[PDB]
């Protein structure tokens, strides 16, 4: 088995991401001061936000902001969904009845990219609200990915596996790869077990498909992808065993080339803390057929808080 090599590629928060990240860090501050002194936000909207805020979902929001703005609702602002909600009723599944404060409440909890896909599934009423300015390209991790993919695919003429812990990220990447004119296949935990083979075979047979995008949990499916010798970890796991398992879809018996593995890490972000503190372990439910636990989330929130103030 030829050697594997792991690398870190640092990314920056673009302007849109910086704004989103800073908002979350502000909530972290307001939450952390409540947690230890009882101080509440004098602004009404900010105070009520804390009732549903925990270390778990704040750490989750910071992780998503390190990945992609379209994991959040900002383009489809309150004024925007109000018009889409009034608008969607004219669709047949909804013409008989859609309560308006019901569809709009549903929309208020969706992300910009989910709302984009909603407009792409009900065009006759919402197509005018679709994203059509390459907003899925606007992320520091996509900037980094586009550079790395050009090296692998154009300069090296090789294939690559891309892993993410977030199916929402995989959805966004599908539009990114289409914009970049790279053919791809996809296999995640929702893929029917029988349907896996057709996808894999296609990957092996078609030299013009450079990219396979997968959930990191597919690292555990015992699939063999040695026709690729590059692996991109779009977002790392807090358990390094998972990212090693993912990389070993390529780095395994039958592989004839050295395998190069690159983990994308946003600088000045929680991803740096996760890289430092990740701990290698085996699972207890291994005998059975990404939210971090409370203690871990508490520790990450504390570190972020201490390094600010």
**What order do the strands of the largest sheet run in, or round the barrel if closed?**
1-6-5-2-4-3
Order of helices and strands: EHHHHHHHHHEHEHEEHEHH
DSSP summary, beta strand count:
6
Number of helices: 14
Query: Helix amount, in percent?
Result: 40-55%
Give me the Rg, rounded.
21 Å
Largest sheet entry: 6 strands, parallel
Percent strand equals 5-15%
- How many angstroms separate the termini? 49 Å
Subcellular location: Nucleus; Chromosome
Protein name: ATP-dependent helicase FUN30
Subunit structure: Homodimer.
Domain Helicase C-terminal: 144-293
Describe the structure.
By secondary structure, this protein is an alpha/beta fold. It folds into three domains: 1-12 and 139-288, no CATH class; 13-72, no CATH class; 73-138, no CATH class. It has 14 helices and six strands. Helix 1 packs antiparallel against helix 3, helix 3 (55-65) packs across helix 14 (294-306) and helix 4 packs across helix 6. The N and C termini lie far apart (49 Å). It is classed as hydrolase. Keywords: recA, remodeler, hydrolase. The assembly is monomeric.
